[PDB]
Amino acid sequence: VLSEGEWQLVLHVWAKVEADVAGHGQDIHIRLFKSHPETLEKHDRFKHLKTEAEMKASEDLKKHGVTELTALGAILKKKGHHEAELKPLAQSHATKHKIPIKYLEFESEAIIHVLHSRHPGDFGADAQGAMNKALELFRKDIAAKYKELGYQG
Numbered sequence: 001v002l003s004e005g006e007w008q009l010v011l012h013v014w015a016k017v018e019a020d021v022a023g024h025g026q027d028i029h030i031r032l033f034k035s036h037p038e039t040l041e042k043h044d045r046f047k048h049l050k051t052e053a054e055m056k057a058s059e060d061l062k063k064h065g066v067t068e069l070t071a072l073g074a075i076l077k078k079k080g081h082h083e084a085e086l087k088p089l090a091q092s093h094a095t096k097h098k099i100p101i102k103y104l105e106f107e108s109e110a111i112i113h114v115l116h117s118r119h120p121g122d123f124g125a126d127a128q129g130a131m132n133k134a135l136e137l138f139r140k141d142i143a144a145k146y147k148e149l150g151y152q153g
C-alpha cells in the first residue's frame, strides 16, 4: 500500500506529465528502445524507425505512447484500487502482445528517467520513492493477473 502522502506525490508529478502526454511518451519509448533493444522487437510496427528523429516524427508511435500513458494515468489515479483497469491490460499484454514483467520493469525505469529529465525540481527523492512504489504495486498486481490468465510474468 501507499500512504496518502505518497499518492499525492504520485498524482502531483502526473499532473505535470499531463501537460505533454505525447512528448513524455515519445521520450520514454526512445529511452526504452535504446536502453533495452529487445523491447523494440515486441512493438513490431516501429522496427523501421531507425533514428530518434524518425521516432519523433512517427504519429503512430506518438499516439501509441499517449494510449499507454493514458491507461497508466487512469490506473495511478485509482491509488491502488485498480483491478477493473488492470484486467483488460493484463489480458492483451499477457496473451496477445506477450510482454514479460521484466519489460514492464524496463518501461518503469524509462518513465522514472524521463520524469527526472523533464521535471527535476518536481521530482526529488520523496516523489521518486513514491512513483517507484506506485509502479512497483502496478507491476505486482499485473503480474498476479498474468498468472491468473495462465503462464508466467
Ligand code: HEM
Residues within 6 Å of the ligand: 039, 040, 042, 043, 044, 045, 064, 067, 068, 069, 071, 072, 088, 089, 092, 093, 097, 099, 103, 104, 107
Ligand atoms: C505502463 C506500462 C504500459 C501500459 C499501461 C500499456 C498500455 C497499453 C494500452 C492501453 C494499449 C492499447 C490496447 C492494448 O492492446 O492493451 C497497449 C498496446 C500495446 N502495448 Fe502496452 N503498455 C505498457 C507497456 C508495454 C510494454 C513495456 C510494451 C512492450 C515492451 C508494450 C507493448 C504493447 C504493444 C506491442 C501494444 C500494441 C501496439 C500496436 O502495435 O498498436 N506495452 N499498451
Ligand SMILES: [Zn+2]
Residues within 6 Å of the ligand: 029, 043, 064, 065, 068
Ligand atoms: Zn509502448
